[model samples]
Each structure stands twice: as structure tokens, then as C-alpha cells.
Target: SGFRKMAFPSGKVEGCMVQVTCGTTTLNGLWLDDVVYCPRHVICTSEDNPNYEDLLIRKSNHNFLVQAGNVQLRVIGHSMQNCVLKLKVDTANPKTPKYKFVRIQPGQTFSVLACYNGSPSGVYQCAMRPNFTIKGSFLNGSCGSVGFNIDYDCVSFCYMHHMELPTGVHAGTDLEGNFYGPFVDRQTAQAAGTDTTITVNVLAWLYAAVINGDRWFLNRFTTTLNDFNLVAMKYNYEPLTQDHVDILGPLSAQTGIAVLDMCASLKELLQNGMNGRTILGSALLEDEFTPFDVVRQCSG
Candidate 1:
């Protein structure tokens, strides 16, 4: 299956030497009986050899760490030639599978990011194509299933309990005490301002206070509050009063208590500053003068 017609060189001397060249390198003194083959074709032939022992399929992990929303798949090719891979999530009525035709050069790899919208746990299968070879065994091999589930809420609660926050006194309560239902509702509403532009600014400030923090973060925090005050006043809303400032004093004084306490204090100050106009006019009363008992009830 591999013969080609060739013309012999005229006036060639017996035992004359021939040179073989591949790219920039050359081999001299090759005899007429020496065989030459394309490197890629050689690889294909060797890979198809039945006695070959190298693994044809490899993966970064036998079982994937899949989350609910999105996850990654990493497949490694140990095949002799470039290959087309077929991958699927095994289900009752399967969703369409994914195909990747990749040239996995020597010492290189293949990776994919796949999205799964099914229930938390399921099986994912991968196969090699062109020859449609099932990579490994069906039950306990490369065609294995990936298991996962999402329970972040349960995990978070467990983490809190593990940290002794649930039953511990004050338990960072100075910060924790300030951020329950009523506070969250009020803060969320205020951050959701009427005008698009102002609302965006308010949302950014809220995010910065919640997510970014350090010496400079606190500086930015104060600046965010001042900026929100100006915006509130422009809309004829009541700006932050000194009572609000006093409510935040314990936060700075008790810095060593807990980081969460500081977070709560800052969140409350910003929330109050943004909603001061409506809050001052409502029966909710000024938080600064409200009794601790009343504040606790509202916080819950």
C-alpha cells in the first residue's frame, strides 16, 4: 500500500552513498536498502500497533470538581496523531454532547470550559473519534461519572457554627447585630435609587464598602459616604445627621473586636446616610436615639 514509482539516477556508481534530509538536519551514507518514512505517518502506524503499551487517554483528574453553574474539563492526548474528542454528560435523555478536534502536539494538552444546567450530580463521559474508541472501561475507567452538588448556604452556616459564631456571646455581635433583616432591606432600597446614574454610583459605593477594605479602603469608605450625602441633598433628601455619626463612633473605637463588627458599622452608616431623607420623615425614628431593645428587634 505504500509503493511509489521512482527514476534511478543515470551513470550512478555502484555503492554510491545517499544522504537523507529532514528539515535543517541531514544524514549521509544511507544505503539503498535504508527505509524512509514520514514522521507523522510513522507515528500513526506505531499508535495503531496492537502491542503499544502507552496510555492513549489521560485526564487531569479522574473525577472532576464540578460546581452547579459552570466547570472545566481537562483532557490530555497521548495518541500518535491529532485527534477529535467527543464528550458528553450521561443522562436519561442526554443533552447534546461536545466535540473538540484538536491537534495535541507532543507535551501539550487540551482544555474546555463546559456549562451544566442539570441537577448537582451526574456522569460525564469522554470518547475518542475518527475511530470512535471508548477511551477506557465503561464502569471504573476513563468513561467515569463526575459527581457534584451545590449547598453553599448549608456550607456557610456550618462555617459560622465551626467558628463558634452561633452560640458565642457578642460573637462579633457589635458588627453582626447591625446587619440583619430591617437593615438589609433599608440598605438595599436606598442603593436602588430612582435615577439610573445616581443609582449606579450608589451601587458602586455599596460594593466598595462591602468588598474592598484596608487603610485606603476606609478612606474611600468615608469619601463614598460624603459623596452619597451630596447626592441625597441634591434630591432634597435629608443628609446624614450627627446622630448617624455618633452611632458609627463605637466602630472605630472598638476596632480590635472583630472585622465583621467594622463591616456592620460601616454598612449601617452608609445605609443610614443614603436613606436619611425618607427615614427622618418616617415613624422608624432616628436610629441613634432608638433604645438598644428597639434596635435589636428591628435588626432581627
Candidate 2:
């Protein structure tokens, strides 16, 4: 609740983020295979974590975060300045060589690194690591007004809501994370032990339809539970599925995210699936619609 969503200053993808203050001298954590993964969702520095590897130093292919292209540096004010721009990933070795050297004329744009035909419905899932530094020396030369410019995009990643955010586990764009389950819950389920894993490619059209339609239904339906019960009781005495089609089928070429026989609500979730690890939440957390515990708290 303390953290609010913050947008990246400039990036191709539209997503949400939150900053963390993991505290000083408290030390940092390891990348992967650590005893506990990113305890507070913090990306640890090498100084704090022994297992940490500097990407440039180790030539680590697995450590690539965001794939960037069309990266250029524009020089302004001065021309033919033989300047070498020193850049590094924030948590990398201070002496690491992300440095680039070039003699660029004023207003000349240097292609620093010369480098999605996509599913039209897919979201641009770009992300950026913060506190990147571009350094140059004062006594050496003038590289003062060089503008660091880059074009980048996020790779297509499925929205695995089970995966923790600020970390690109499932690559889901949680615009406003109202219903995001915490990392702890996922671990708890694993501890208890747990699926029919359903990997749905949610088409973008159906996505918008649901969002706009949810707001529409919210305004149209009862604001209070008592009113909801009353409305159901009065001459409105019918199955909740009466307007199901009308509600879900409002817009688009239509959709089908159905299972012929599955628990619809909490009682059906707990009462029917009580035995044999048939829990409400599943080992397969990819199914966006399952895990009705939130539904129970909010509406039940």
C-alpha cells in the first residue's frame, strides 16, 4: 500500500513500477538460485552479494535485461571532440568497460550501437533499469552536451500473475495492480504442495472489451451487497447466469474462456474441492480467472 505506480521516463512499453529503499549496510541479495530470491524484490549489487556476476566482466549472456536497438549519442555545442563516454549498469564493476569513444561533430548523431514484427494484439513489454550513469572527465575534453538516445522495446512475455513484478517473471503488464497476488502466497502454495496448466493467449481486443465493460457493469449493477441481494430477490429472482451472456458478450467478435464443469465461487471452490490438494488457487497460476480468494474477500 505504501508504494504507488511510477512510469518510466521514456520507453516504448507502457507499464507500472514502484521504487524500493532496501536500506544501507543491510547488504543485498543474489540474482538467481539464491536461498531467497530478491527478498524485497531488490536487484542486488555485487558488493552486497558474493554470487553476483558483472555482465560485462563475465561476458554473461544470461544477464541481458532489456534488448535495445538504434542507440545513438548526439553531440551538441562542440565539434570533433574526441570524447569517450563512460557508461555502466548501476550495480556493475566501477571499472567495467561499457565505455564508448568517438569524435563527433556538434549536432551530429553518432550511432553508439548499430543494431517487433509482432502479434498486433500484444503489448509492448519494455522495461529499463534505473540509475544508469553516463560519465566523462572534465580535464580530459568536452563531452558535456552529448545526448544519450536509444530506442528499445520489451520482449513479448505472458502475464504470469504468479510471478513477482519489478521482476519480469511472466512479463505481465500490471497497469494498476489491484488484484496482484504477492510472492509469499505463491511460496506458501508451493510449501503446501500443489494442475491443468492453461496458457491462454489473451487477444488484445477481448482485453479492452473486458476493461471498458467492467466499468460499464460496475455503474449499472448494485453498489452494495444488500442491494445486490435485494435486486436478486425482487422479481429479479433468477440464476446469476441469467445475464451472463449479455454481460460477457457485450462487445467484440466474442470469446471463450470456459471449462464445462469448474467451481464458480468460493463454496464451490472450498466445499467441492476440499480433498486432495484441489485448492482454489492452482499450481498453474497462469489461469487469470482462478484463485477466487480475492473475489471472496471483495464480494462474498
Candidate 3:
């Protein structure tokens, strides 16, 4: 992982200095000198003496050493409450870099290894900031303290769904006839027109059922649509309404199987119109279409 805990002096160590070096870069001026003072047998007169009624030994300072490499950043929590440790790399640039935050519970340690592919030749300065609040009442003085210090240097380096279809199942294909795995990246799925393809296909099937007056298939599609709407609402997405059913039912009945224009409009509604602006659309556009069976069997 990162560093090993070694035995330090019993009680608190005061006036301890710390520094970190990574490759050619070095950072210093870190101190672990904050010590909690307690009164002696209900009485002490030193100005630095802790005045709180509940006199108990509390250490508010800690330090650790991290070696340069693809090492993990570790944080140890010693307080009663969980402590949030934020780790940041200082590139010394105008754009402030994003930091990694981890919560460590009392007496627990957390670590994360770095995994960015870049030339690890630059002088990367890193720092650890610890924050926490004590829980007890303070009769006379502050109950807790927080601290921050620039601690590490990296010698070099950098760091950095869905679908359903069919009773049996259908493979997804792009316009160019390229087949894709069940799960795909957003870009690849988008390029393959996965969502559009499914929408068109489903509409085609529905249109066929409507034209042939296949009440059984229409019922299946209707049930599927109802289940899909419930799923949409579960995720706070807009659902298909009775109005949509009204438009679709009457259109299908009046025109029989000829549903290209009606299906096109419905496709647009589900694609870029009201339905398009929904998490349902996002779910459908996932690498695999959402499963019709899952939705059909799913309840509110």
C-alpha cells in the first residue's frame, strides 16, 4: 500500500517536523506539534494547560511518510467521529486540480492506489488535509483541531447500458452492419445508432401487429409499454400516457397496418421530443436495450 506504521514515542510527540521528497522535487514546512494538555488532578496553572472539565489525553496531530512510486495514498483516522481526508496534487497551474476524498472511520485506515498513464517525470507536489469534529461538550476550551500539510511529490506521472428486446432476443447492429457486444461504451453505442435502431424495430413490430389486427401481439406491446412507463416513472422519467395510447390505438385501428408516418411521429416522440428528454431514453440508449421481460415483470 503506502506506508507502514512504526512505533513512535508513547504519549504525544511535540515539535516533530516532516518533509516529503519525490524525485528531484522536495516540499517541507510540515509540523505535527499540536498536543492536547490535561490538568493535573483537577488543578494546573500553566497557561498552555487544557482547561476543559473532562480532562482526557487527546492527540490532534499525526504524520506519515509516503515513498515515491505508483504508491497508494493512505489516511488514518483516530478520532471518535469519521474524518474526511482530501488528497490533492499541486501542479502549480492556474487550473486547480480535482482532489480525491476518502472518509476514514475511527481507528481505521483508507488507501487508494494511483492509476494514471502519463510521463512520471514532472515534479508533482501533493498534500493531505484532515478535517473532523469532536462530539463531547467542552467546558472551557476548543474541543478539536484540524490541520493541513503539503506531503508528497510524484517524480513523474499523471493520473487520470441497456436494452431490451424481444421474447427470445436480438443482437444489436449498426447502420454499417457492425455488430457490438451486449454492453457498449456511450460513444460506440451512439455511433452504432443502437437506440434509434431499437426504437425503429419495436415500432415496426407494433405496426405489423396493428396492421394484421393481431390483438394478441397488440396486447403484448401494450403490456410492454405499460411496464416500460412504470419503469420510467420509477426513475423519475416521463411515462407514456393514456393520450399516447389514444393516438396510437385510433391511428392503428383506422389505418390498419399502414403505420410508417404514425410510427415515425411516435419514434420522434420517444427519441427527441418529450420522451427523449428522459432517463428512460438514456436507459434505452444504453449498450443493451432494457429487457422487456424485466419491465413486464417489474412492479411499482
Candidate 4:
């Protein structure tokens, strides 16, 4: 069906009401569309019946109607100084239908547009484009004092993570040759090319930094590994010692010794998961130094 024609005064006025018969279940969701405001009653469809066609409403009829007789309206004020009308249908039935307007300010300019939805839900919320020509304007409701703008840093950071980095040889030269293949074993390397030998070099410096009794290096190692696992956006075969020190130094210091201890303990516990639950439990209580001397704390 169509919306029951109603007139609204122009400029600034409050407490406006319009009545529409909730014909069938299809017309349960009601909305006022194509509103023209003026000093006198302005016709929406024809000048002769200007007040008769107060508002131009395009709608469809339905069979199932709401069981209630009355509905209440709530107004929403946007930053554009317009009050959007929210019609709550059938307050008696909590699950009744409702409609929301986009913008409805008197002095401010606004456009009411419709959006399409494929889902089985009523789509009556208006699409509003805000106009801020006048300063310090007031409406039926309140609007936020914030401004919207594009963030360049956030856009660049997101692009760094989502977009792939160019790799391999930029120029077809052996100096910038890219390393490829599984490199799992020497046999595969020998099969690929003749006179090519697999080389195994011990990373003694890094091994000593992690394995030795140097807590500083161990802390750095854990922090660097954790960053690689969680935060580091890209991983290239390049030295990142300075970068790791700058980024993870303060974080590791704030975290203190417990972080490293937790990781070490978890690594030991995870080894048990390789077998079964029985072995896991046995590993948890492996230290038989004090079984009954454990103290328990209880609090609400």
C-alpha cells in the first residue's frame, strides 16, 4: 500500500505526528519518504491536491499485519543538524517491525536514498548524505562534535601487510641471483646441477648467544623469535639485529624474567603432547621434591 498523506511545517517546529493504518502484515514496517516542507501545505504528487499528497511514499502491500493499533516514534540527531525519525511498530509486541529515517533537519539540506538487501529482513533505513553549510545548527536530537577524515598511516600500514613484496632477481645477473629449491638434503642439490656442492656452515655465534649462560642474549633471542612469530610484517634473509634491539629491547625489559621462564616451561610441556595424556601428566609433576608441601590460596 501507500503511506497515508500527512503535512509537516517548514523551518523549525516540534511534536509532529502522522497516522497510517497498518493494513496487512506487509505494511507493518512504515516509513515516510519524499518529504517536502513549506510554510503552507505543499503537495508531493500534485499542486491541486498539494496537502492531499503531503508526502510521496512508494510502498508495497502485504497480507500479514501487526496485531497492535498504535506505534511510537524516536528521533535521531546526526552531525548534519537533522533529526531522523525512528518508528517503533507495536510496542505491545516486542518483536514488531520498526523504521528509521536518514535525515530530517529543517534548515540543513539532505537526501533520502534507499539501499538494497538480499536477506530476509526489512530494509527501511534511509541513506543520508550530510551537508554542513550553516554553523551551530540545532535539531530535535543532538549530534556529535567529531569530524571524519582519511588516515594515511593506517592505509600505508595495511597495504604493507596485505600487498606482496617484489622478490627474486630484478636484473638477470648472477650477482643478484635468487636462492631456490627445497634445500632439504645434499642429494637433491647434486641431482639439480653438476659441480655444485652442498655446504654446511656452523652458526656458532648465534648458537652461543642462545645456548650460553648469557641471559641478555637469551632474552633478546626470545624477544626476536616472538616478534617474528607475532608482529614482524616481513622476513627477508638480511641482518635485523639493530632493528630487533630497537623494537624488542624495551618490551623484553618490561616483561622481565618470567616471560622467558614461561616459554621454557611450555616448550618442555609440549614435548609430552607428542606421546599421550598420561605422559603429559607425568611430565607436569616430574619434580618429586615436594608433593604435600604445596600451599593453596582461596579468595572471592
Query: Of the candidates numbered 2 and 3, which has the greater TM-score value?
Result: 2
Which candidate number maximizes lDDT? 3
* Candidate 4 runs further than 4 Å off: 1-88, 92-257, 271-274, 278-300
TM-score for all models, in order of appearance:
0.16, 0.20, 0.17, 0.16
Residue 65: error of model 3 in Å?
A: 2.3
Tens-digit lDDT track of model 2 for 1-300: 111112222222211111111222121111111111112212233243222223124423222222112221121111111111112222322222222222221111111110011001121211111111111111111101111222243222111121222221221112111111222312223221111111111112122323323211111211333333343334222223323323333222232322111112211322243344422222211122211111212221
User: In order, what lDDT does every prediction score?
Assistant: 0.22, 0.20, 0.25, 0.19
In candidate 1, where is summed lDDT lowest over 10 consecutive residues? Answer: 155-164
**Model 4, span 54-88: residue lDDT tens:** 22132222211222234333222101111111233
Best by TM-score: 2
Full ranking by lDDT: 3, 1, 2, 4
Worst 10 residues of 4 by lDDT: 155-164
Model 1: how far residue 298 lies from native, Å: 13
* Tens digits of per-residue lDDT for model 1, 1-300: 111111122112112122222223222210112111111111122224222223323222222222212332222212222211112222211221121112221111111111112121222222111121112122111111111111221100000000111122100001111211111211122221121122222222222222323222232223345655665455433445445445434332334323233333334444554343332233221221111212222221
Choose 1 or 3, whichever is better by lDDT.
3
- Pairs that clash in candidate 2: none
For candidate 1, report its TM-score: 0.16
